[PDB]
Design a protein around this nucleic acid. Structure first.
Lengths: 285, 285
DNA sequence: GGGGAATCCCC
DNA sequence: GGGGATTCCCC
């Protein structure tokens, strides 16, 4: 049957969710491959095409049975409820989502809009109103929905409709908030010293972009046909105000080196597997 | 005749102003000298006392003619408007204001809090109500009072009353909000190196509490019967995310030293003159 | 497109 | 009492 397929995924990291207060002109969610100059935007296509179509995009959660998220999509052809709906011409069955903004609901707002979604979703298929019992149960699956909803991760859902007749919804990979503390861009600004003894144990003052003291690591490594890794040693007290890490370097694997060796080091969040660009450190005999 | 005198002023820096949402039990505004184990609180005394008395404190602007601040005192024996009122016994004429807080008004709160204290002021000495014209001009103070009021600086105003009968009001020194980006205690957490060449030019990484790029300095000095002083060398790019300063040490005043010499360095505010606790640095040959 | 100010939550 | 997450602001 006709199916929709995502041809260019949204970029997983690097994009920021904006609050209402910020404005509408803040930059559209870019494709999974958008380096300098060549920028891409999420794109999908209806394959084995049947009848001029329609594609709708909305924000779902990260958890599995996809449910609508408190966040809303904003911008180019976006409805006041966070639904993006476009028409995919008779012949060209591909839609490029040029300008997708992600609206960040405040916690003192979630409850309200979560209910407006569930009402809109409930009085959707079935009839028009909600009796008092019905409006009470709504505020529970929004109170207990709040408690489990991750406001820093959303997924894009593409629901296509042939002229309406629904094609199975296709969900994209997760999109993380680049402003949220735990999904910020990792960067090594400056480093104290870039050389030390092979024994390791040299104290280093690395200045970096915000990190969370209990979710950050300084990984030293080298990549030949084998590979080696070690981690700078420090305590949570050593991460100064989220923007600096004071640590002792780890030992190199061979102690008996006759010449100085240069290895790579990067910041890494224990959980995410996310890393910073790499800097270098040289071990001395 | 009887007058009030501040026996122990409030501490000018390091105290945090709290918003209504944080809580009422976060600590009292301490005295000028409150190091580990023995804390003092602002204290005043009615010298050459006349009759048991009544002392009241409230927040006045930093601006000279002391006018009431939009911020209110919170805590022990404080009224819902931010006036603290106590009675000093027939004997001991000293009042130690043990638990005084500063409730921080939001910028969206300011106007309403301001027209409300201004109304209360109107129907103070003079008659009971406000005509619309009187209310329109009361709201006019509020707007033109907001535009020139520093929400980061307040002053305590002690008003003593002989049982009532007024005494002259005594205004304390400014009190800076430690949470305002530009008002806390300059503090040197730790630094890279504590020794370097008498030639000056050695790069030091200093970790500090939040500081302003363009309002900070690194003052080196040694106070004998002379007084040499010099400065760290760094550009605002060298002040990293307000929590670290990468600077190059200055040259010592005598290039010909034969024995190492210990001098001191300290962080200093440019447009203020307050310094952090000084750390030592030793110049070597 | 991004840094830092202002407000709030919480161990 | 303090650290940092959130929400907002404005260059």
């Amino acid at each position: 049957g006709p199916y929709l397929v995502i041809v260019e995924q949204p970029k997983q990291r690097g994009f920021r969710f904006r609050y209402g207060c910020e404005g509408p002109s803040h930059g559209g969610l870019p494709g999974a491959s958008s380096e300098k100059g060549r920028k891409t935007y999420p794109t999908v296509k209806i394959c084995n095409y049947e009848g001029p179509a329609k594609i709708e995009v909305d924000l779902v959660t990260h958890s599995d049975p996809p449910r609508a998220h408190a966040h809303s999509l904003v911008g180019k052809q976006c409805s006041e409820l966070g639904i993006c709906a476009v028409s995919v011409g008779p012949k060209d069955m591909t839609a490029q989502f040029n300008n997708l903004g992600v609206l960040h609901v405040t916690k003192k707002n979630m409850m309200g809009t979560m209910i407006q979604k569930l009402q809109r979703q409930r009085l959707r298929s079935r009839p028009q109103g909600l009796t008092e019992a019905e409006q009470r149960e709504l505020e529970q699956e929004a109170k207990e929905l709040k408690k489990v909803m991750d406001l820093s991760i959303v997924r894009l859902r593409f629901s296509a409709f042939l002229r309406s007749l629904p094609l199975k919804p296709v969900i994209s990979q997760p999109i993380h908030d680049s402003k949220s503390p735990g999904a910020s861009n990792l960067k090594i600004s400056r480093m104290d010293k870039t050389a030390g003894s092979v024994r390791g144990g040299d104290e280093v003052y690395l200045l970096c972009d915000k990190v969370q003291k209990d979710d950050i690591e300084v990984r030293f490594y080298e990549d030949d046909e084998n590979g080696w890794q070690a981690f700078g040693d420090f305590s949570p007290t050593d991460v100064h105000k989220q923007y600096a890490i004071v640590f002792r370097t780890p030992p190199y694997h061979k102690m008996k080196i006759e010449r100085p060796v240069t290895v790579f080091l990067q910041l890494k969040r224990k959980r995410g597997g996310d890393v910073s660009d790499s800097k270098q450190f040289t071990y001395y005999p």
